[PDB]
């Protein structure tokens, strides 16, 4: 007997209202915190000091409200045995489900939308993935399967993996189906990369989705729900080994970490997750390129140099890379450089959607506001990744 406690019924609407109150609070203190840094430290001597203690307590209460709103993952894992132990006996197989990390929690709103996606993955493993006991012993594999549903925390995110030891996702079958619909593929892609190509419209672990799977939900629909929640998805499978599908879920989508770059008067911002390195290339690492462009040599690899002033048509920018600064970015595995005039530093600005009064423009994803009052345009890294390909 360690320690006990009690609980009281609380309406979900009341708990959701807390996220709205603390939400604006975290967003309000973030804007005010930036103003105290830009202004002189005289009047803001003790204000900046108190902001540090509030900046941490502001998130502690936020994470506390969320944690109270989450629920253990065991409640979600308690529904998989219903489909594993039952379908195994109906089809004539032996599959034992294993649960790892039951102490993990997850938001209630996320549990009402991740059960069916994961339920579809388990259904495919018990039909196309895992084979019969006889076929498994023939290839030296154990008769009884081993489905594992792992889950754990990750700072401000939650990781959920669905490891399987079935027949594995075929490689030659995905390349033939992906190339038919018009998807860029190649033989250089390893078995883990080809597994990420099963997200095409109307397609899943098997070509027959609507015919086999009753519910009209597949990898294309699963990823759609993940985008609405702000998560990601990864697959690391291989033929004759197993299958694993990872699914991430965020917790707070109101602050974006990114450095503020300046390009002649106008100021922009670049995401921090995409920025790799930065330096000042000289004449000993700059070569021409077909089409009046240039490339940056980074440890032998010649990366494409994309001018940020050409996309926005900024007058008076540092056209020469020796005078300005070049930052190495990345989006979708491939890396690419970006030319700017002068840097500022890392600042956690608040995302501001521009579609509220107009619409998205090419080369920009979101915006925000600085301490003084000027608006800062957040450049889109996904758009710049497609410009170098056309060069």
């Amino acid at each position: 007997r360690s320690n006990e406690s009690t609980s009281i019924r609380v309406a979900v609407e009341k708990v959701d209202q807390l996220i709205n109150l603390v939400g604006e609070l975290v967003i309000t203190q973030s804007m005010l915190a930036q103003r105290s840094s830009e202004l002189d430290p005289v009047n803001h001597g003790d204000l900046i000091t108190s902001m540090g203690q509030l900046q941490r307590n502001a998130r502690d209460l936020q994470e506390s409200v969320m944690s109270i709103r989450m629920m253990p993952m065991e409640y979600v894992f308690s529904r998989y045995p219903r489909l594993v132990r039952d379908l195994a006996g109906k089809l004539g197989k032996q599959v034992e489900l294993t649960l790892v990390g039951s102490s993990t929690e997850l938001d209630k709103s996320l549990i009402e939308r991740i059960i069916d996606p994961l339920t579809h993955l388990v259904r495919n493993s018990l039909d196309h993935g895992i084979e019969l006991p006889e076929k498994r012993l023939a290839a030296g594999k154990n008769s009884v399967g081993n489905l594992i549903l792992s889950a754990e925390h990750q700072g401000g995110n939650i990781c959920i993996e669905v490891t399987d030891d079935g027949a594995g996702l075929n490689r030659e079958r995905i390349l033939a189906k992906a190339a038919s619909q018009g998807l860029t593929v190649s033989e250089n892609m390893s078995d883990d990369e080809v597994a990420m190509l099963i997200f095409a419209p109307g397609f899943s672990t098997a070509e027959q989705v609507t015919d086999v799977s009753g519910r009209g939900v597949g990898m294309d629909v699963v990823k759609r729900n993940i985008q609405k929640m702000g998560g990601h998805v990864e697959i690391q499978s291989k033929q004759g080994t197993g299958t694993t599908i990872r699914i991430l879920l965020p917790l707070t989508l109101a602050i974006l970490d990114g450095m503020s770059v300046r390009v002649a008067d106008e100021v922009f911002i670049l995401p921090l997750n995409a920025v790799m390195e930065s330096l000042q290339p000289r004449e000993a690492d700059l070569h021409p390129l077909a089409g009046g462009e240039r490339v940056l040599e980074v440890r032998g690899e010649y990366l494409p140099i994309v001018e940020l002033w050409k996309v926005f048509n900024v007058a008076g920018a540092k056209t020469e890379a020796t005078q300005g600064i070049v930052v190495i970015l990345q989006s979708g595995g491939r890396r690419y450089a970006l030319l700017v005039d002068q840097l500022i530093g890392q600042h956690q600005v608040v995302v501001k959607n521009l579609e509220s009064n107009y619409r998205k423009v090419p080369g920009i994803s979101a915006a925000t506001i600085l301490g003084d009052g000027s608006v800062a345009l957040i450049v889109d890294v996904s758009a710049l990744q497609a410009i170098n390909r056309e060069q």
Partner: protein, 51 residues
């Protein structure tokens, strides 16, 4: 002519020293030392360039 060269070399030293501070903070806790070191090296370049 030498002052023009020192200004050019000092300018690159300030930009190069600035990138060290940015790359230092990118690592997080594994670059706190280079942050102040790089932040101070660039300061000397501005004084030398301004001088």
């Amino acid at each position: 002519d030498i002052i023009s060269v020192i200004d050019g070399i000092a300018f690159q030293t300030n930009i190069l020293a600035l990138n060290a501070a940015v790359e230092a903070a990118r690592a997080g806790e594994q670059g706190r030392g280079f942050a102040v070191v790089a932040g101070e090296v660039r300061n000397l370049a501005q004084r030398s360039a301004q001088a």
